[PDB]
């Protein structure tokens, strides 16, 4: 019902309560996974599967 509880004023205060510490850890995971996907899935050495035209979900569900 969002009535009350500890509310950090800014980022630096997230370490003043264990629950908000876990919350900021989770936020870091969430936001840092995206750059990892950028680096991994836009890599120069990434190569499409040669047999990608052999089969696809589009023909399966059709």
Contact set for another protein, span 28-57 (CB under 8 A): 28-33, 36-37, 40-41, 46-57
Beta carbon of residue 38, minimum distance to another protein (angstroms, whole number): 10
End-to-end CA distance of the chain: give it in Å, rounded.
46
Beta carbon of residue 44, minimum distance to another protein (angstroms, whole number): 14
Radius of gyration in angstroms for the set of CA atoms belonging to the chain, rounded to a whole number: 21
CB 23: neighbour CB atoms within 10 A? 13
- The residue ranges that bind another protein (CB under 8 A) are 1-9, 11-33, 36-37, 40-41, 46-60
């Amino acid at each position: 019902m969002l009535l009350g509880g500890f509310v950090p004023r800014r980022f630096s205060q997230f370490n003043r309560d264990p629950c908000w510490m876990f919350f900021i850890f989770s936020v870091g995971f969430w936001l840092g996974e995206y750059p990892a996907m950028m680096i991994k899935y836009n890599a120069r050495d990434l190569v499409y599967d040669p047999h990608r035209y052999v089969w696809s979900h589009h023909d399966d569900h059709h």
